[PDB]
Design a protein around this ligand. Sequence first.
Ligand SMILES: [K+]
Ligand SMILES: [K+]
Ligand SMILES: [K+]
Ligand SMILES: [K+]
Ligand SMILES: [K+]
Ligand SMILES: [K+]
Ligand SMILES: [Mg+2]
Ligand SMILES: [Mg+2]
Ligand SMILES: [Mg+2]
Ligand SMILES: [Mg+2]
Ligand SMILES: [Mg+2]
Ligand SMILES: [Mg+2]
Ligand SMILES: [Mg+2]
Ligand SMILES: [Mg+2]
Ligand SMILES: [Mg+2]
Ligand SMILES: [Mg+2]
Ligand SMILES: [Mg+2]
Ligand SMILES: [Mg+2]
Ligand SMILES: [Mg+2]
Ligand SMILES: [Mg+2]
Ligand SMILES: [Mg+2]
Ligand SMILES: [Mg+2]
Ligand SMILES: [Mg+2]
Ligand SMILES: [Mg+2]
Ligand SMILES: [Mg+2]
Ligand SMILES: [Mg+2]
Ligand SMILES: [Mg+2]
Ligand SMILES: [Mg+2]
Ligand SMILES: [Mg+2]
Ligand SMILES: [Mg+2]
Ligand SMILES: [Mg+2]
Ligand SMILES: [Mg+2]
Ligand code: NA
Ligand code: NA
Ligand code: NA
Ligand code: NA
Lengths: 119, 203, 50, 159, 52, 125, 103
Amino acid sequence: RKSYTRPQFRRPHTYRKPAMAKPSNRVTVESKDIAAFNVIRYPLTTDKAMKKIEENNTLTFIVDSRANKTEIKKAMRKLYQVKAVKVNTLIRPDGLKKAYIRLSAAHDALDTANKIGLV
Amino acid sequence: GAFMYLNELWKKKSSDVMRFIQRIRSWEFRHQHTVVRLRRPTRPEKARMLGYKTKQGFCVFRVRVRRGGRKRPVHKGITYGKPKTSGVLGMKLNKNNQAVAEQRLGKRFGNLRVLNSYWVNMDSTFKWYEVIAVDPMCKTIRRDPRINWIVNSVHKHREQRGLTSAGRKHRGLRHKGHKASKLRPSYRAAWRRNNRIVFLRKR
Amino acid sequence: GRFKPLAVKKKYAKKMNQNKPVPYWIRLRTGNRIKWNEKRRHWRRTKLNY
Amino acid sequence: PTFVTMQRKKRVLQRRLKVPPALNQFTKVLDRASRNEALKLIKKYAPETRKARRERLQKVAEEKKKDPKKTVSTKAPLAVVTGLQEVTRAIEKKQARMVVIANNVDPVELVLWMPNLCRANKIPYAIVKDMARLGDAIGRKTATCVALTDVNAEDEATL
Amino acid sequence: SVPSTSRAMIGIISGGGRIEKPVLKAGNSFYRFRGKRNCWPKVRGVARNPVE
Amino acid sequence: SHHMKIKDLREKSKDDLLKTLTEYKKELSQLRVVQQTGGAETRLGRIRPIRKSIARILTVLNQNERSNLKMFYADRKLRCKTPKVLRTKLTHRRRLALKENEKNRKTSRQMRQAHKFPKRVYAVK
Amino acid sequence: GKTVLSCRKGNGSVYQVHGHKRLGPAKLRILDYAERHGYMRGVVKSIEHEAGRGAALARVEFRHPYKFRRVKELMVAPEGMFTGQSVFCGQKAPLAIGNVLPL
RNA sequence: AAUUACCGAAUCUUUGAACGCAAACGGCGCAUGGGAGAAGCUCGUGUCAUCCCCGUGCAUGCCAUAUUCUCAGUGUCGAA
RNA sequence: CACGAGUUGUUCGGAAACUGAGCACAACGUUAUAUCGUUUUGUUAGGAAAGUGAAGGUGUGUCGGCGG
RNA sequence: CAGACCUGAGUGUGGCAGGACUACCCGCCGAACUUAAGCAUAUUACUCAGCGGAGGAAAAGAAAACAACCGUGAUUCUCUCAGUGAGCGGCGAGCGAAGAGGGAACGAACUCGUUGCCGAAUCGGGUCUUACAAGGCCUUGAGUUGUGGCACAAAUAUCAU
Ligand SMILES: [K+]
Ligand SMILES: [K+]
Ligand SMILES: [K+]
Ligand SMILES: [K+]
Ligand SMILES: [K+]
Ligand SMILES: [K+]
Ligand SMILES: [Mg+2]
Ligand SMILES: [Mg+2]
Ligand SMILES: [Mg+2]
Ligand SMILES: [Mg+2]
Ligand SMILES: [Mg+2]
Ligand SMILES: [Mg+2]
Ligand SMILES: [Mg+2]
Ligand SMILES: [Mg+2]
Ligand SMILES: [Mg+2]
Ligand SMILES: [Mg+2]
Ligand SMILES: [Mg+2]
Ligand SMILES: [Mg+2]
Ligand SMILES: [Mg+2]
Ligand SMILES: [Mg+2]
Ligand SMILES: [Mg+2]
Ligand SMILES: [Mg+2]
Ligand SMILES: [Mg+2]
Ligand SMILES: [Mg+2]
Ligand SMILES: [Mg+2]
Ligand SMILES: [Mg+2]
Ligand SMILES: [Mg+2]
Ligand SMILES: [Mg+2]
Ligand SMILES: [Mg+2]
Ligand SMILES: [Mg+2]
Ligand SMILES: [Mg+2]
Ligand SMILES: [Mg+2]
Ligand code: NA
Ligand code: NA
Ligand code: NA
Ligand code: NA
């Protein structure tokens, strides 16, 4: 017999074969190059948004309400080839998420707005 | 063959040796769970007689039921209405304990089909029955012409509807003819037959 | 007050979106029966209580 | 663990209480030297395996196909009788010359009656220590009882 | 009578004489029962209604 | 018109379909900008054909992928690992129900009795 | 009629012990091997008051008989127990106030 | 490439028996595949730490099963 | 009333991430039936619920010291 | 020592159970208003409410059945038996069936255990045949603490050739 130095029996550790990765159960085709189009929906053109474009180098967008500030930065780089130094977000009382995106001093927000088409 | 000696031995439960064997087993069963899985039946001849086979897909479980009369679950034993319904301790369940043990096993393990059950042991506090269960998804069960009828969905939870041998017992289906005319095909069906108002079109 | 679950806020947002009058061109449809929004809500009349 | 405590307490309760002769006879086993000799004879006459039976039947089938008119006996070589049903028939019909019964069959009702049946039919019998050792002699995991109905001339003295 | 292997502590329990001081106030009883349980004040049975 | 024909989709390869999907997703996003900043109704009328073209591209890609994967898992050695999303749906009861082969099983005695006394065709004059 | 107050208290509910701010149950140390054969010497570390109890409680620190640690039992202090007093518990403990001995 | 009707091929957000853990929290994990990566490194190309995004597996119970998986028992043996 | 707008967080509040009066999933037991009971007086369950790992043996890399 | 068996665990792999629906059907649980010109037995009622469980039906069903005849012949259902010169009932209020007869339906019958004779001939799992074949080959994996085959009144061997 063995020797037990503890006053109660505990389950001994035995060999545990690890589970194998199963074949994928989701077989739909998802394109990585179109993800940013879901993250960024469309820009805003209100008086407040227009004011921030020329004074704060900031663009205003309606974004996916489940999106990340980090992901919005990545989407801005992918869709418009600009570097966002700061993203501020709020969920509007209507339910949509709005993002204030300040571009780096190297990029001109007004020029980016012209290329986007909001002007 | 060997069945006869086993069968006659179990007709002598009150003998000295069978009493000793049942006493040791009853002590062991007292220190086990309410529901316990077994590798083999305790009474193989009785299990086989009731439909058990030593085949992949057949399972045997021992179920413990508490002995005694049913107590009416009213607060502080306070009943209302007529004094005819005032009894608390002296009423008895209209179902037998074997059916209760089968229903306990069937409700706990919904993936199995209950086939039958049999008495194994009892003490002052507990009664034990061993219940035969069948896996409807087992390939051996599905391709066996003798048991694969239970795979069909009509037999799902047959023990809950009192269709087993114990269920038939307390429904009154052991008797035929004038002994069970008012209980056939069921008492509710007989009540429907005898109490519905018939309206012939031309009366 | 300040606090509410995002789920409560989203439900309040949808009720805001629904609280709109019937568009004028709806009344000009061939088999139109709608004149005014029968489910208009005012914050002082009926309480949503979310 | 609970199962550990219960299996030890079960042995205690079996020794403390009064055991009737029907159950008590299974604790008075055959001695070790005779038990080893008996199991050696059983192992010598162990039943043929699935493979060996299969090549024997295939050889019989080929001989039948080679000479369809001739008749080839399908009888298996002389071996011990194993299994509760077959051993019981051998004892009832008095073909068994010796019967070996395991002493640790659970449920014990399976073989509780066998020593009395052997005594009634005047068949020599013995009770041994392990169904596992009996199963090992016959090439199985366990064996409740094993009966010898015939041996070769060289093993007649040993029997 | 108790088994002789049962243990005991030498001496008397500390804090004796506690019940010798009159309480003098319902408030002192209130503080006394704050740490024990909800059993004070006590209403006499004759002051209740026969239903209860 | 920005209308992509289903016949040309079914001939395009996977990479070409993904490329076309990106172009139509991009152009749809540009139209969303027009929706915000007013815009001419002629440009706005392109939104629906473009959205439906995107659906057509995705339909072809998903139909092709499902067909290819069913072919791959049609292998007898690999059909036990087929994803449930690709197995036949039918109904919960029907998947669990006895098949005809299992339901028609007979004992050896039953088989012999059926052969010994088959049902006959007869008439009375 | 209605349930009497004495019966209602049996339900528990709002008539249970106000156990918050209590230090825990007061007991002697476990009757282990050391007590049955030799003795265990402890030190009284604090004399404390528990709400709902008139008697003072003593926290007595012992060494663990099998492990490298301390035990810190909690007992009902007899009259005269003081901080720093040595408490002897076991078969061989001397007859003195505060010690625990077999009867 | 009209539009209707029908149906075989598809899509099918958050959820709910709801089942990785929670929840007036659109929250937080353990594995395993990816994705994006302006710091650092290499020759703007590659690669990429922390951070971030996504797919799959992971409730409990039961049955079957193990190229015959890993173990426990002063249970019964048998060999040291 | 109609239309158009407004709520920007590494540090503020919550959560991630504490315990309290308490709650009751598991587990076990009970009940004809769980939609019942136990579940903090250090604390689940007759109760095998630890997958975490000190010193070591085996390879890689970062080092101090000797000899050649 | 090992090792085996028994009993019991951990993990991997392949599956199932969970909820909804619930008119009808099956198993439990189960009242009272009401009626008796009051009321307790009784009646409402083996009902409503409550908890479980199925299917396109369910349940029942191949005699330990009726009958007492010149006999009938699984079950279910219909007319009828019959509000009954049956019976039950403070024999009060009320309650209350069964066999037979005319019919509907019906190719309606089968399986196991046991017994006797056989004894792995069985089952899963790989693998091949266009095949997860009711097939061949292999397999200790299960199984002799017994899978399966043949015969038992609709019967009068099986077992080759
Ligand atoms: K806004
Ligand atoms: K009562
Ligand atoms: K309201
Ligand atoms: K249904
Ligand atoms: K009246
Ligand atoms: K209820
Ligand atoms: Mg914010
Ligand atoms: Mg406020
Ligand atoms: Mg108001
Ligand atoms: Mg509110
Ligand atoms: Mg044999
Ligand atoms: Mg008073
Ligand atoms: Mg008063
Ligand atoms: Mg309390
Ligand atoms: Mg969840
Ligand atoms: Mg919270
Ligand atoms: Mg207004
Ligand atoms: Mg608490
Ligand atoms: Mg408690
Ligand atoms: Mg405990
Ligand atoms: Mg259900
Ligand atoms: Mg009424
Ligand atoms: Mg009245
Ligand atoms: Mg009255
Ligand atoms: Mg009802
Ligand atoms: Mg029909
Ligand atoms: Mg049916
Ligand atoms: Mg009939
Ligand atoms: Mg008449
Ligand atoms: Mg009645
Ligand atoms: Mg009839
Ligand atoms: Mg058989
Ligand atoms: Na009542
Ligand atoms: Na009838
Ligand atoms: Na051992
Ligand atoms: Na508005």
